[PDB]
Amino acid sequence: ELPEDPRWELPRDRLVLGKPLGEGAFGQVVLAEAIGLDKDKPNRVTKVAVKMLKSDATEKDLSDLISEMEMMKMIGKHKNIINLLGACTQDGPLYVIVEYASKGNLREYLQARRPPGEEQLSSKDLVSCAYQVARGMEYLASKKCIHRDLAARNVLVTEDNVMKIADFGLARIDYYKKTTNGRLPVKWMAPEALFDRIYTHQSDVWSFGVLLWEIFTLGGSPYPGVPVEELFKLLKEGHRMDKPSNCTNELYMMMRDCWHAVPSQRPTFKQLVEDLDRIVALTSNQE
Template sequence: MQLTMNSSEDFHRNEEGWQNSVIIIPALLSGSTLIVVAVILWKSIRRKRDKRKESKDNMRDIDGEWAVNAAGVYENSLDTPDPILEKKQLSGDWTVEHKVFICNGHFGPISHAVLCRSGVTEDRQYVVLKELSEHCSPGEVQDFIDSMKFYVQVCNHDNLVTMLWCQTERRPPSLIMKAMSYGNLLTFLRSSHEGVEAAEGRTPTITEKDVYSMASQVASGLEYLSGTHDLIHGYVAACNVLVHEDLTVQLCGLDLAAIQYRTGSIPRRRAAQVPIKWQSPERLKGADITEKSDVWSFGILLYEMVTVGSPPYPDLEPSQLISKLQKNYRMERPALCVQQLYEVMTNCWQWEAPLRPCFTDVVKQLQNATDRANGHTPLIAIDTLSWEEYLRVAGIPS
């Protein structure tokens, strides 16, 4: 009997030991596994950190941001001749002189300049120079090259800004465009608000007939862009129209179209950078941009022109716009806008995109009305806003 009891106790002790082993051994194995994984992760993170440090050591600190050394970037990306750009290379007997800085563009500084031919003093050409910043990334270098190709392959229309020449064999790389006498249309229009004299010592003015003529030129450029190349402009506005002294115009600001040409789509982040008051309702709601989105924006451009550069929706904050449009709110007909032109605007502002006209129809409507338009009475600015006040009301970051 005693033997039986001892055997039972031994069995229970052995069972308890076995159970403890079952618990402890896996725990030890799991713990050691976690330690090994942690060590591997730590080494991986350290390697990545060391690589980032090594990469940064090869960069220069520009205004608190790390920028790739441009010399190396240029060498890697621009030294191989591109057959598309070769025929547009500025020949060696031309030099760029008298650069006057205008602003910083997406890729780098933009300047007015003069092209001069060696030994020929009278052979001079006024141009706009777009240069690639020396603090660019490798991706930006490639984007700049692709932008040049876009101008060569797509911008072959009288009402689209064209690239005259490019420089990829000299530093810094640049593209050279024809200078338009009056600059962009917004500046041209706003100059009459502040009494600023334009070129040749006169204050620029436009008539109703000029509005029809310039608008039909812009619409023609947009018709070509969408019809021939299936591309969207994405930011149709007075600031993206260039004006020559004879009031011929060319559409510029083609960055989004160039991205779409290269990649097949427009990133929503880039599309959202366009000021809200120029965006169509579907864009404000996050939908894709289409030709009809550009048509809506073209209606806003017509408003800018006939009001001689007044900001759209002057009584609304940008944050109020989408809710007001959903309630069928549209801008009223400006005082100096004839009913026929206002109808073109409101057709562009149809809530349902398919109901808006295409640019082919818009061109026909504007051209048919041009001959009957008033070509004698100058249009008068309807606001007295300063430039800073204009930017605030328009919702454009200063």
């Protein structure tokens, strides 16, 4: 049995469950329609994403779902994060109701827009995407949240092309474990986070640098064919990824600054938001 929180509770007859969303990257998530989430009006439907537990769910799987919801309540609202919209906690399974992003993850969204062998993104659209992700991250940081897994796969894209950071309310690692696409999350990890288990806003700044690299290569894979052990060796040697093609030196120096050996010397998300805001303004939409 769960305690009823009336700030968030939505009656069960007000949620129409639909087809599963994606390849279960964020757990068991379905598309749904919520009848009257707002008082004006109780007659409007909103497409929402609903997270619930699987059939083979443990008492720990339920505890994590609750913590994530409670965490989302505490963080508050921001344009550039997946927002909590409601929950079904009484007389049945737990349903955590969050914002729906119809264009999928930033890696997919970017990949579908790569020039041929939907539509192409200009040089400004790419800088705008980065600006939005740094904006989202800055909010979470201001609310004391450390993501730990910032990647393009954890950035969802809405129908209106808004960048929304996902999987920010979770708190946990197997270095050899792969993602859905067959990629290794250790590749986005700061060395101090990787070797010393030291997680900070600074280790998230490292990850943002890899995320910018993902935007500028239009969904490129970091370190292809590089196993865990060889990656360790690259980081220890001070190796850094090469400058993507059709990337300015100003933006490559931002990735580099993000990947500073010394965590204190990296820019903050507050600083990144300022720099990217200025760069968006000066970036051409003509190419």
